[PDB]
Design a protein around this ligand. Structure first.
Ligand code: HEM
Length: 190
């Protein structure tokens, strides 16, 4: 949803940086009518990168710290945004189970402009989960922002890691998600 992420971007720059700063951003892309068309249109990916680059120059904000804050705000926007989308879900682990089975099936059927990659889930056990992600445009900071944001609304603490074998390789990325020890504090026995 390129239209929906545009709405999220306008709210974030105006509220935390200013309206004058917000005005400079709208000049880099340039308006045409008002600026807020609501979520219903789809723009290119270069459109997203062009405003992102202006952010690193107009406010001097790093592209990695900006991508982290961005993921947190938009994800919690969808949670309170759709009560039946969070009602059907029962937990974060269950989220991974139908993250593409039904959540991205409704999105895909709705508008065909969106394009998604491939996702395969392997389950090593109860505290071990592996996710395979095949895409030619893999940004780890982007995916982590979305998974941790989810654990932000639920209020939890999971750890998302990565493996160094494909750590610096595109197309194939291996992620390891584990549950950090919690619940009292049992190291082992005594
Ligand atoms: C944290 C949970 C979810 C994960 C892990 C996830 C992740 C992703 C990823 C990785 C993509 C595309 C990334 C890329 O190709 O660069 C994507 C795009 C998208 N997701 Fe999700 N998604 C999740 C939940 C949701 C939810 C809740 C919905 C909304 C009901 C949803 C709707 C979409 C849409 C509309 C796109 C397409 C955006 C675009 O085309 O640029 N996602 N999702």
């Amino acid at each position: 949803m390129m239209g929906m992420v545009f709405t999220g971007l306008m709210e974030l720059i105006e509220d935390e940086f200013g309206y004058e700063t917000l005005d400079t951003l709208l000049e880099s892309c340039e308006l045409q009518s008002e600026g807020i068309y609501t979520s219903v249109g789809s723009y290119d990916h270069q459109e997203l990168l062009q405003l992102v680059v202006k952010l690193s120059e107009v406010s001097s904000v790093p592209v990695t710290e900006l991508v982290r804050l961005f993921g947190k705000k938009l994800f919690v926007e969808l949670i309170e945004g759709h009560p039946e989308i969070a009602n059907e879900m029962k937990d974060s682990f269950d989220l991974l189970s139908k993250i593409d089975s039904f959540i991205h099936v409704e999105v895909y059927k709705l508008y065909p402009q969106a394009e998604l990659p491939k996702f395969t889930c392997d389950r090593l056990g109860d505290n071990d989960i592996r996710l395979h992600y095949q895409s030619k445009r893999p940004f780890a900071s982007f995916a982590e922002g979305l998974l941790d944001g989810c654990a932000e609304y639920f209020k939890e603490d999971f750890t998302i890691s990565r493996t160094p074998e494909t750590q610096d390789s595109e197309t194939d990325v291996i992620f390891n998600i584990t549950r950090a020890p919690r619940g009292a504090e049992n190291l082992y026995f005594q």
